[PDB]
């Protein structure tokens, strides 16, 4: 990092929630390259359940971890909207499989609380870099699949890489009142 032109530091350091490595997208589909680097995150697996349905089962387990159920006595609460992993099939439709990823604050990042839910697991190390896009429309699950495809095509003319069968989505808020909710789909960079 910065070759050998580094000064005395390491003690106190500030890390942005996202690292902008590029900008500019398109009038039809705008995207931005952002790299996130943390420490520990809360992952929840949900089978035999779609995305919206799974989150309903995942949120309770993941919420208890951030709320007051970690067998420690900490007050995490919450932090920004949660993101989940979705594995799109060749048919364009998911196959019941979603993993809810939680962003733990630097405060607990150094030593997060011991999970109480056997379903809630914390993964150490391994950062992910994805691109976020903002559009004016609704999106539940199958609709997201269409959005994730657009981003891929958009980056088609760029060095931007991806996984191939897994991406993340952002929303949280349910599709009720328009002009107030924002849906975004981030692809996992390979």
Swiss-Prot record:
PANTHER family hit by this protein: HEME-BINDING PROTEIN 1, HEME-BINDING PROTEIN-RELATED
Single annotated GO MF: heme binding
Top-level division of the source organism's lineage: Eukaryota
A Pfam cross-reference name: SOUL
UniProt entry tagged with the keyword Phosphoprotein: no
Subcellular location: Cytoplasm
Known function: May bind free porphyrinogens that may be present in the cell and thus facilitate removal of these potentially toxic compound. Binds with a high affinity to one molecule of heme or porphyrins. It binds metalloporphyrins, free porphyrins and N-methylprotoporphyrin with similar affinities.
Comment block on domains: Forms a distorted beta-barrel structure, with two helices that are packed against the outer surface of the barrel. Porphyrins are expected to bind to a hydrophobic patch on the outer surface of the beta-barrel structure.
Protein name: Heme-binding protein 1
Protein family per UniProt: Belongs to the HEBP family.
This protein's UniProt keywords: Cytoplasm
Keyword set includes Methyltransferase: no
Subunit and interaction comment: Monomer.
Any GO BP: heme metabolic process
Expression tissues: Ubiquitously expressed. Extremely abundant in liver.
Species whose genome carries this gene: Mus musculus (Mouse)
Major site of localization recorded for this protein: cytoplasm
């Amino acid at each position: 990092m910065l070759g050998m032109i580094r000064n005395s530091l390491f003690g106190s350091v500030e890390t942005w929630p996202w690292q902008v490595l590029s900008t500019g997208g398109k009038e039809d589909v705008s995207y931005e390259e952002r790299a996130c680097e943390g420490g520990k995150f809360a992952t929840v697996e949900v089978t035999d359940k779609p995305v919206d349905e799974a989150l309903r089962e995942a949120m309770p387990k993941i919420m208890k971890y951030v709320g007051g159920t970690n067998d420690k006595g900490v007050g995490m609460g919450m932090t920004v909207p949660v993101s989940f992993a979705v594995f799109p099939n060749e048919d364009g439709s998911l196959q019941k499989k979603l993993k809810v990823w939680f962003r733990i604050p630097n405060q607990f990042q150094g030593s997060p609380p011991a999970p109480s839910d056997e379903s809630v697991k914390i993964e150490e190390r391994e950062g992910i870099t994805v691109y976020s896009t903002q559009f004016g429309g609704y999106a539940k699950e199958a609709d997201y699949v269409a959005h994730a495809t657009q981003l891929r095509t958009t980056l088609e003319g760029t060095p931007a890489t991806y996984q191939g069968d897994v991406y993340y989505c952002a929303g949280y808020d349910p599709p009720m009142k328009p002009y107030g909710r924002r849906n975004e789909v981030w692809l996992v960079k390979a």
